[PDB]
Design a protein around this ligand. Structure first.
Ligand code: UD2
Ligand code: UD2
Lengths: 480, 485
């Protein structure tokens, strides 16, 4: 019935949600009905109650102990051993990857950064997956698979799926790319009243990348992982053009250390850089998001002169399947919602659409890294920024950096260095050799299919000079 | 005597510079005649021979004994600062701005000093620098009680001299006295093709460009600038680059540090963390101190890391040096001639045989330049002072995220972010429209905060303005008070 909904709405004190029901057409009424039925108002009030209460952790924060910190630089003597371990896991079909792509206008993964090859982030990531499958198979002699779970939201589900089919899945098997949708949460005013965006539309938005755990349960994702025989899952953010998807070194490091949970970080050197920091609070590992840290804590220096909290989270995590299992149906409830005031477009009492110039409500979100505190063995792996982290944030968030152009330059500079490191050289139109840091930038792009992290370029560049822009793909060397 | 000049040019292998003489009007030939007459072709050939002929592994980090750190040595900051302010109060400090470069890469035809990065107050780099000088004159007068002066020497080039002077006069020298601002122009060098021929830009014009910021030393001689410093009784000179919006002009800490260490030469640096960052690195070769420019370092060296995990060569030059007047006196009268030219291959526009203008597709010649830090090697006592990037270095080098970073946007955001931090550290707070307190690192305003140097030089003196208060950004704090835009 449609009367049970009115009884429930009044039981939660959220009856106002049906104030324009008598002015709505059949189509409108059925569209709103399906939206309200899929909501747990009793639980939502509970959520708001706890969340709003948040209207100090800093004193309790402790640095990451050297005992759990691994470093690709300081521990380069172990890189080969870890990489081989991660490579073996991949060849045994025991490694899967999970992309967080529920955030929003079109899918960030479809961004064309302007590379000479013009590939999108999604494609670059897929070629790194394909490449690792190739390398592992040519190293252990067996076709292996790395499933690609992609968490999407109601805002990008349809759009993303069509983009992948249009591209034949970039060369991957459609059956190994799993799309699952993330849940939503209603915007609420400071008094705890769900906000109507339209006369027949509740104001909704994705429930944070931490909504991942509820989505896994809803779509039985964990069971699918256990069915495939996966043991390790690499979770990562979609906007980092340099992301080493299924990175064998990180995976090998975590497995070698017998961890059930791991976090990859880069050295944070600017106190106000917008990255959360890995730390320990009351004996348990956590990440204090950048928006929740105080200036005094963010600016604190240690004896050696570096920031005390310098483990910048780059949203690249390692989770064992069994660990995710326990989180999905045991710990999940313990996760709390982080709150943010927003200016939410809504329908006033006069049935008019208003765009407030002042916050009129809050948004609740769960964070993917809030499960670190439940791990039995947490580990941290430090890498170099120029090799693995160059995020692309929205236009209003760019501010000179973290934009399409800085992302493009970061990948091309990296590939340019791989060329020089493999004995290659660049020259001008007169054949004069160019310096490593010219006073063009030297445009250079190397497809992941050819090189994953700079290896296997000896045959293509050793003792050779090139005229940039240089491109090296599955079709050889091309000097545009 | 056009016949003598012809003979002089030909003996130097340069007679082609008069190739279009018979096509120029009487007026155009008098200009070419004067320009050529003011050139030393013999010297130019010698310079070309050394440069053309010039066609690592010995580098070493500086010993910890010569490197001081604002963070590691925080305990000594107060003493160094006191020494610096004392020097200033005794009228023993002058500053020297390098502004002979053009603002072309930025997309404009005027001097970078005049650029407006869009701050709330709309102030230019020149003005902000001027108020930092004024502030230290006032601060010093309050600690010691006497009125003091910090002479401002400004090196321009042929292409920035006129604009700069007119801009300053139009603004009343930003509050400073005209007699304490000294403008002097650096020299120029001609572009030359690989064969050794000086290049003509027009039938009657030699292709000329500023001779490098190291051309400062030759200019100091040609304008008798050192005599002017000695006459003023100056002991310490702070040399700095115009494009760094965060530059601490006449910084009493850096100056005091150098004085206490008995240095005659010092360089300020920030830690270089990215192997390919375009800053030179301070180091030493055969016991001699120097800077290896980013364009002359090899990738293997740039990438080298030490045990602690940081780059082996991590002392990044931010073009902020300290020189004493006696040392510059020796540079000008002895060392200068021993300074070498750095060569850059370039595509230079020229006039061909058929009298046609051409823009080469391949590099056709070279440009020679001297570097301001190449005198470190002659210092009797060289020291290095390391500071934090977010507090002291944010360069303006590119158009506007049409080259990535080091553009107007990042420069504006770096100054405002710094001032926002000052407010927070002094006990202030920022709030939204409903009085709710904003976080130190908000999810993307960015917070717009701008504090005049006349109020705070480096974050001090703000407690009476913001302790326990909350502000709606944009926040401006200047000589007229606190203003919430
Ligand atoms: C919570 C979190 O991870 N914060 C990290 C993330 O913050 P950010 O504020 O940069 O990003 P964000 O939390 O909005 O989203 C990060 C990733 O999560 C995805 N997403 C976001 C919301 C949602 O409901 N669903 C969803 O799937 C989004 O598509 C992206 O792939 O990145 C920074 C690096 O630049 C850091 O490492 C910050 O610590
Ligand atoms: C030679 C030198 O200092 N290199 C430094 C300078 O390189 P850059 O290549 O970034 O700059 P640059 O040498 O073109 O000029 C630096 C400063 O010198 C001035 N100038 C330049 C040429 C000239 O003929 N006359 C003149 O006065 C120019 O106006 C600016 O104030 O800045 C970087 C930081 O951003 C570093 O610290 C580099 O090591």
């Amino acid at each position: 019935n449609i009367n049970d909904l009115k009884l429930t709405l009044s039981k939660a004190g959220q009856e106002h949600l049906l104030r324009f029901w008598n002015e709505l057409e059949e189509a409108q009424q059925v569209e709103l009905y399906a939206e309200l039925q899929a909501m747990n108002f009793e639980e939502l009030n509970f959520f708001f109650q706890k969340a709003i209460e948040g209207f100090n952790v800093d004193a309790r924060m402790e640095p990451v102990p050297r005992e759990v910190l691994g470093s690709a630089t300081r521990d380069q003597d172990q890189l080969q051993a870890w990489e081989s371990e991660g490579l073996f896991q991949i060849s045994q079909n025991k490694v899967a990857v999970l992309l967080l792509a529920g955030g929003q206008a079109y899918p960030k993964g479809m961004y064309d950064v302007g590379l000479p090859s013009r590939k999108t982030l999604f494609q670059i990531q897929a070629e790194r997956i394909l490449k690792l499958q190739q390398v592992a198979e040519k190293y252990y002699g067996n076709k292996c698979i790395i499933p690609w779970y992609i968490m999407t939201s109601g805002r990008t589900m349809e759009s993303t799926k069509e983009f992948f089919t249009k591209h034949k899945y970039f060369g991957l098997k459609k059956e190994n790319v799993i799309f699952f949708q993330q849940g939503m949460l209603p915007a609420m005013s400071f008094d705890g009243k769900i906000i109507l965006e339209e006369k027949n539309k509740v104001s909704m938005a994705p429930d944070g990348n931490g909504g991942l755990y509820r989505a896994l349960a809803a779509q039985n994702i964990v069971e699918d992982m256990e069915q495939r025989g996966i043991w390790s899952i690499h979770v990562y953010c979609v906007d980092n053009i340099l992301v080493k998807v299924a990175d064998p070194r990180f995976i090998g490091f975590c497995i070698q250390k017998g961890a059930d949970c791991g976090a990859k970080v880069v050295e944070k050197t600017n106190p106000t850089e917008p990255v959360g920091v890995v730390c320990r609070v009351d004996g348990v590992y956590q990440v204090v998001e950048y928006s929740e840290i105080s200036l005094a804590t963010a600016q604190k220096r240690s004896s050696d002169g570096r920031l005390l909290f310098n483990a910048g989270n780059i949203a690249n995590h390692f989770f064992t399947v069994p660990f995710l299992r326990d989180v999905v149906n045991v710990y999940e409830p313990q996760l709390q919602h982080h709150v943010a005031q927003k200016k939410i477009p809504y329908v006033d009492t006069q049935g008019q659409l208003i765009k407030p110039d002042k916050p009129n409500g809050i948004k609740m979100e769960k964070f993917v890294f809030d499960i670190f505190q439940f791990a039995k063995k947490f580990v941290v792996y430090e890498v170099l920024r120029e090799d693995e982290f160059s995020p692309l944030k929205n236009a209003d968030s760019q501010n000179g950096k973290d934009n399409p152009t800085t992302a493009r330059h970061a990948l091309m500079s990296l590939h340019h260095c791989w060329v020089l490191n493999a004995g290659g050289h660049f020259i001008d139109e007169n054949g004069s050799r160019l310096p490593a840091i010219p006073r063009v930038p030297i445009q250079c792009e190397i497809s992941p299919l050819i090189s994953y992290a700079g290896e296997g370029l000896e045959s293509y560049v050793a003792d050779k000079e090139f005229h940039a822009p240089l491109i090296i793909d599955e079709n050889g060397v091309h000097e545009l």
